[PDB]
Amino acid sequence: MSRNVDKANSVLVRFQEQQAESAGGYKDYSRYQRPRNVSKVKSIKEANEWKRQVSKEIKQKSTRIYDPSLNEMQIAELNDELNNLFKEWKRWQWHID
Amino acid sequence: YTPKAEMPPEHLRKIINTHSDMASKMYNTDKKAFLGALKYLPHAILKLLENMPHPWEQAKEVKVLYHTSGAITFVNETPRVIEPVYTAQWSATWIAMRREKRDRTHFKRMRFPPFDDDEPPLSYEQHIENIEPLDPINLPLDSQDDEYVKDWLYDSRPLEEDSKKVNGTSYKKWSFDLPEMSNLYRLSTPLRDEV
Amino acid sequence: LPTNHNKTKLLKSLKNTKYFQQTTIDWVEAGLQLCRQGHNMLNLLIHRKGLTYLHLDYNFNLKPTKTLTTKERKKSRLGNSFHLMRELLKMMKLIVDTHVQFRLGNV
Amino acid sequence: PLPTKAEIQECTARTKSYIQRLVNAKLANSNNRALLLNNSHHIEVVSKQMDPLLPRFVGKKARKVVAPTENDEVVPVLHMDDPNEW
Amino acid sequence: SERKAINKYYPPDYNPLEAEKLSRKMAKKLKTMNKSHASIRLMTPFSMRCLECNEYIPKSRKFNGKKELLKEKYLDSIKIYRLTISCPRCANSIAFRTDPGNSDYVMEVGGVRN
Amino acid sequence: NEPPPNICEQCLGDEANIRMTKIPQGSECKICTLPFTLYHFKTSKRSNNIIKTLICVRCATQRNICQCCMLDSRWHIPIQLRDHLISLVVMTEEAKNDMMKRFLSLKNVKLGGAQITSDPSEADNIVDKLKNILLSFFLYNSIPEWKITDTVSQLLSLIVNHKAKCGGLRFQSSELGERFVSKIFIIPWSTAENIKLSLSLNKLIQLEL
Amino acid sequence: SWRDKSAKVQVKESELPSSIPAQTGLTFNIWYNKWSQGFAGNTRFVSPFALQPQLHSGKTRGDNDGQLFFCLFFAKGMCCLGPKCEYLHHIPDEEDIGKLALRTEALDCFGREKFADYREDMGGIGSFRKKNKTLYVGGIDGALNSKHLKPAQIESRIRFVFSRLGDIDRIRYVESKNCGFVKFKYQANAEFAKEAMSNQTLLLPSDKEWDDRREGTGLLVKWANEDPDPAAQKRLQEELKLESLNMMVHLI
Amino acid sequence: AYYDLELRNSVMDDILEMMPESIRQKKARTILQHLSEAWRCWKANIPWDVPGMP
RNA sequence: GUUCGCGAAGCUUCGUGGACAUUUGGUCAAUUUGAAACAAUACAGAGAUGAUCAGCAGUUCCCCUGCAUAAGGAUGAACCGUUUUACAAAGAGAUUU
RNA sequence: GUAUGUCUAAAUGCUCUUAUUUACUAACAAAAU
Ligand SMILES: [Mg+2]
Ligand SMILES: [Zn+2]
Ligand SMILES: [Zn+2]
């Protein structure tokens, strides 16, 4: 399990995380992938967390896309990615509450 | 100047118990104290070990200093003995052990460690209340041969306080009569085996 | 050949303060206290160091919770002092543990 | 003149006292074992015995400190008075 | 605390099978482990030119690549891998495949061998 | 070697004997964050709460202040105020930085103004100069509510916006109000024209944002 | 009138004063009392208690003995000592302020060292360098559980909470910034208010979201960075001048 | 390494002592380089003869 | 409360003068706001030199682990950039007084 | 010797597959009769 990722997703760590989730309510919304279809999330806190995560992602995307080699295609691709992120964020701002 | 106040053990116990689940802004300084105490923890260990109750002793009471924070606890007394008496005691214990060995088909040797790595060592308050600690190692005596020594031989302070045979409770010097000495010598035949 | 000068032993100095007070205690009790106090010390120090992922058994055998990333490992390599202390504590526990057992009807 | 014997002795005493004092202070500082007035008003200073477990010198924490030179008076740096070879 | 650590501490209630099951349940949800292009450190055997900026990355030069499994194996039961690299100057994704028929590699829309 | 503590007369107390303990490198000074000896005294034996010194002697010297009060050694005024007065007749800029503050502390210049306060010559002169220099109901028509409240009390919840200038006092009792009216700055129930205009303007301003 | 109003206080009994931390992290660090090995959680949670001062405020063990400093816990609204508390339980009156006005430079009304530099977030116990009586209120969205209220209503609510807590100088709610500036007469009073209203809900019993006030995040009450717009500045300057004049008068 | 450093320092000091200079810091580096070269030559058994060297 | 004396009622009880003992503890007050770190996600990613790699130092208003004046930390951290004047002498041509 | 750095506002249970590993790390060391 060299290079840290393996360590992170080693069974023991996972178990610990699960335990934390069970007792006290420590989740790491960084750690899990954000769900595709909203309205399968009855809790508000979770939703908020997800929204926050997406915002963070968007910010990250923004930070990188103004790099100096602007003509490279990665940046262009991200522009679409950025849009997608924005859309997701908007969706997360649903009007149930 | 004026000596230390002999505190109650109860207070000490209470102090100890308080600093188990210690995680408030209350006792910030107690944690610091605890940290500091590592300095003297080996000393403490040495002390406690030194005071180990000998096999002729059910349970030794012992002098104790302790930081009011509850950070460290030193056994304070340094265990001195009447050398010949001590030797005699040891010999007796040895004899007893031998007898036990002779007796027993299998001798139930301890498992180590004695408590589990998960299980946190029981507080002393679970077994103060428990029944009289089972009998210790002291051999079967006789009135004819070992007439003099038997009464005190297996006592915590090998010779009693307030007697003319030792200095006193400080237990710093001893003077014996002949017959007791002789008895001791007889007892010590295993260990003192010298040319 | 020993110290000509030094009368002042460690305990005496401590006594001379107000922060220590003294009781008479059963030796097993004292041992137990030491075990507990010692354990606390080792945990407290460890937590201060930041490494919260090296968990102490109550038997004093220290070992890690997860498998530590390399940075964490670097942070949390305790040295020849701390380990020695731990070992000493363990030894104490073992003798103290045996006496506790004896006291209890177990042995 | 080579300095007066008495004077020399005095100097030695001064420095000896001072250096000794300094050494003592240093020793005190090391963590191993072994009256006043303000304005007109008189005031008694004390030193309380802190607990021997807590850090002796709780103030200090191995801080970096840049100091100013503070040289107000100006040093006179006085002096006197083929380039292709050198 | 030390790289050759014999036994990692477990909680007093740790049903190992149960724990494993739990992990599995929380592996589909997991971000890492449920993805492709897992990282790797590799030296470059081909010694090739980055097709965008013509940066001549030579033999044995070390990179933090991404190894990914190619689903279409060679023959039957011997896998082949895509090994992504970046050129030092321009950030163009070079990669290569390991077709073991010739005991060597194949370039994959990254650069050219020379 | 150590210099002495600079504690003021009002700081320290009113008595002819005080006992204090010195704690060498006790705490870090609040200004400089640099170890120094804490003096802490109890004023009167039995009067609760200690008075620990919060700053290093050097820093005190620089600012010319009580090591407890944080006030001018001479005039017993907050550093700003004392300095401000001097300026009126230049002020100190404590540099709020991890490293730089320490450096500043170690400098020995008497920062700014402190010199004037220290010397009888200069402080006195400054003082002289200063002397010379010296020698329910809505409510309409700036001043604080604690004054308004006081006024109301004298006359005998009290809302007041300032952008509006529209103070709606609500005693919630017909007795208090009817006493308030008889016992007596426009004050109706729930250059007059000019005032009205101004009020209107204020209201408009309030309402545009 | 707290003296003759009551003696007793007993705000939150020592059975239930507080649980110690709230689980961020995986493991609990014994030395810091803060969860470690992870940081996911906005952390600020709403106070379970509050200062209803008219009910609570009373004589203390401190009042009799002549304590200067007021009870932080009382302010927060959770002083389990109550009548046997050594710190004072009432809203800081003028006389009290006057009495501790010597010390009020170096330390707060709670008897705890004011710092030289402000905290970067202006978050707690103000500096001794800059005297202040002026509190930033924030997180009013969060403190009201994202309720669609009128700004005016919010302002009123703020006034209600803060007037009770101390003699007000002046208050401003702002729609654009989404905040509530408050200014007090006395710094001590302001400090007390801050202590009280840290992590407090602005909601009332009559509101429909009373039972879920705990689940939100409380008021973010902090110190006020001075208002830049010019009239305010001018006013401040005038005040300063007045103060200076007063000082001069005192001197001569 | 330490020894080498010390030697270098000594050499620099000697050179400073030797003759006048203006902006000598730059020249120090050059001197060091020269010394290094000389050492290398010695190691190799090349004669270290440079014409400009006074 | 102990008590050693005096004065009233029936050695017992009240009323008194003394002697004995005499100022603890806090640099701290219990949850967010007086400052712990790892971790995680994302993104890149490894000293010279063409490449790969060892070790040693050095500067610092950077530290960590280490009992350490061992040793170890990405070659432990940042150093790889900016870089126009103690600036004069000689010759030639041009506009202004 | 398992490097590193920036980046962070305050669906539920179910079972079935194994005589393995898309395994990762290379700082560590390098010869014949
Ligand atoms: Mg290396
Ligand atoms: Zn003062
Ligand atoms: Zn209280």
- Largest Cα span, chain E: 60
d(C-alpha G170, C-alpha G159), whole Å: 9
F34 → closest Cβ in D57, D63, D68 = D63
d(C-alpha G25, C-alpha A21), whole Å: 10
Cβ of D84: how many Cβ atoms within 10 Å?
5
Cβ of G189: how many Cβ atoms within 10 Å?
26
d(C-alpha F36, C-alpha F56), whole Å: 6
| Interval between CA F12 and ligand 2 midpoint (Å) | 6
CA of G63 to C1' of I15 (A): 39
Tell me whether residue E53 is annotated as binding: yes
Whether D85 and H20 lie within 8 Å, measured CB to CB: no
How far off is chain F from G222, nearest CA to CA, in Å?
A: 20
Q: Determine the residue type at C55.
A: H
Cβ-Cβ contacts under 8 Å, C57 against chain B: 117-118
Nearest CA in chain D to H19: D86
Interface residue of D79, D80, D82, D86 to substitute, partner H, most H CBs within 10 Å: D86
**Contact, E4 CB vs strand J, < 7 Å:** no
B40 touches chain C (CB under 8 A): yes
B35 → closest Cβ in C21, C28, C48 = C48
A12 touches chain C (CB under 8 A): yes
Output the 3-class SS for chain A.
Answer: CCCCHHHHCCHHHHHHHHHHHHCCCCCCCCCECCCCCCCCCCCHHHHHHHHHHHHHHHHHHHHHHCCCCCCCHHHHHHHHHHHHHHHHHHHHCCCCC
Burial H18-48 (b: 16+ CB within 10 A, else e): eeeeeeeeeeeeebeebbeeeeeeeeeeeee
Give E103's contacts (C-beta < 8 A, 6+ positions apart). Answer: none
Percentage helix, strand, coil, to 5, in chain E? 10, 30, 60
Give A40's contacts (C-beta < 8 A, 6+ positions apart). Answer: none
CA triple B54-B56-B62, angle to 5 deg: 50
Q: Are G and C neighbours with ≥3 CB pairs closer than 8 A?
A: yes
d(C-alpha B50, C-alpha F120), whole Å: 70
The tally of CA atoms less than 13 A away on the side-chain side of residue C59 is 13
What are residue F189's phi and psi, to 5 degrees?
-90, 175
Q: Determine the residue type at H9.
A: N
Where does G9-117 show beta strands of DSSP type E? 27-29, 34-36
Cβ-Cβ contacts under 8 Å, B39 against chain D: 53
Q: Determine the residue type at E69.
A: L
d(C-alpha G246, C-alpha E61), whole Å: 78
Angle between helix axes B9-18 and C27-49 (nearest 10 degrees) is 30
Resolution to 1 decimal place, in Å: 3.8
**Sign of the alpha-carbon dihedral angle for D78, D80, D81, D82:** negative
Q: Which two tokens stand for residue D51?
A: 């607990």
Tell me whether residue E96 is annotated as binding: no
DSSP G104: G
Concatenated DSSP letters for B62-108? EEEEEETTSS-EEE-------HHHHHHHHHHHHHHHHHHHHH-SS--
Burial F174-185 (b: 16+ CB within 10 A, else e): eeebeebeeeee
Whether G21 and B31 lie within 8 Å, measured CB to CB: no
Q: Which two tokens stand for residue E39?
A: 């990282």
CA of C79 to C1' of I60 (A): 29
Give B195's contacts (C-beta < 8 A, 6+ positions apart). Answer: none
Q: Are B and H neighbours with ≥3 CB pairs closer than 8 A?
A: no
CA of F6 to C1' of J14 (A): 79
Nearest CA in chain C to D34: C6
- Beta strand E62-69 with E38-43 is antiparallel
Cβ–Cβ under 8 Å, residues G244 and F91: no
CA of G43 to C1' of J10 (A): 8
Whether B22 and G28 lie within 8 Å, measured CB to CB: no
F21 → closest Cβ in D41, D47, D70 = D47
Say which nucleotide is closest to residue E64, CA to C1' distance.
Answer: I45
d(C-alpha C48, C-alpha C43), whole Å: 9
| Interval between CA G104 and ligand 2 midpoint (Å) | 11
Say which nucleotide is closest to residue B23, CA to C1' distance.
Answer: I30
A5 touches chain C (CB under 8 A): no
d(C-alpha F126, C-alpha F131), whole Å: 9
Q: Which two tokens stand for residue F144?
A: 């604080």
CA B100 to the chain's CA centroid:
22
CA of E65 to C1' of J22 (A): 14
The DSSP element (H or E) to which G136 belongs, if any, is: strand G134-138
**Contact, C101 CB vs strand J, < 7 Å:** no
Q: Which residue is nearest to nucleotide J2 (CA to C1')?
A: A2
Burial E78-96 (b: 16+ CB within 10 A, else e): eebebbbbbbeeeebebbb
Q: Which two tokens stand for residue G70?
A: 């007021």
d(C-alpha H41, C-alpha H22), whole Å: 29
CA triple E12-E16-E21, angle to 5 deg: 125
Q: Which two tokens stand for residue G59?
A: 């004589």
Say which nucleotide is closest to residue E79, CA to C1' distance.
Answer: J22
Give the chains touching D; criterion: ≥3 Cβ pairs < 8 Å: B, C, F, H
d(C-alpha C36, C-alpha B122), whole Å: 10
Q: Which two tokens stand for residue C55?
A: 């968990």
How far off is chain A from E20, nearest CA to CA, in Å?
A: 7
Chain C, 13 to 72: residues with Cβ < 8 Å from chain G are 43-44, 47-48, 50, 52-53, 65
Nearest CA in chain C to D52: C14
Q: Which two tokens stand for residue B131?
A: 């029944």
Give F149's contacts (C-beta < 8 A, 6+ positions apart). Answer: F158, G167
Tell me whether residue E87 is annotated as binding: yes
Q: How far is CA G37 from CA B120, B165, C51, F36, in A?
A: 24, 65, 9, 36
Cβ–Cβ under 8 Å, residues A11 and E20: yes
User: Is G179 in a helix, a strand, or coil?
Assistant: strand
Is omega for the bond preceding B55 within 30 degrees of 0, making it cis? no
Cβ–Cβ under 8 Å, residues D65 and F33: no
Whether C6 and D53 lie within 8 Å, measured CB to CB: no
d(C-alpha H49, C-alpha G161), whole Å: 91
Domain ranges of chain A: 1-97
Nearest CA in chain G to B20: G30
D80 touches chain H (CB under 8 A): no
Q: Determine the residue type at C72.
A: E
- Residue from G164, G132, G182 nearest F149 by CA: G164
Q: Residue written as tokens 């801050």? A: G194
Interfacial residues of H (vs D; Cβ cutoff 8 Å): 19-21, 54
d(C-alpha B142, C-alpha B147), whole Å: 7
| Interval between CA G53 and ligand 3 midpoint (Å) | 13
Cβ–Cβ under 8 Å, residues G40 and A26: yes
User: Is H44 in a helix, a strand, or coil?
Assistant: helix
Whether B72 and D55 lie within 8 Å, measured CB to CB: no
User: Is B135 in a helix, a strand, or coil?
Assistant: coil
CA of C49 to C1' of I76 (A): 19
The DSSP element (H or E) to which E93 belongs, if any, is: strand E93-94
A12 → closest Cβ in C66, C69, C70 = C66
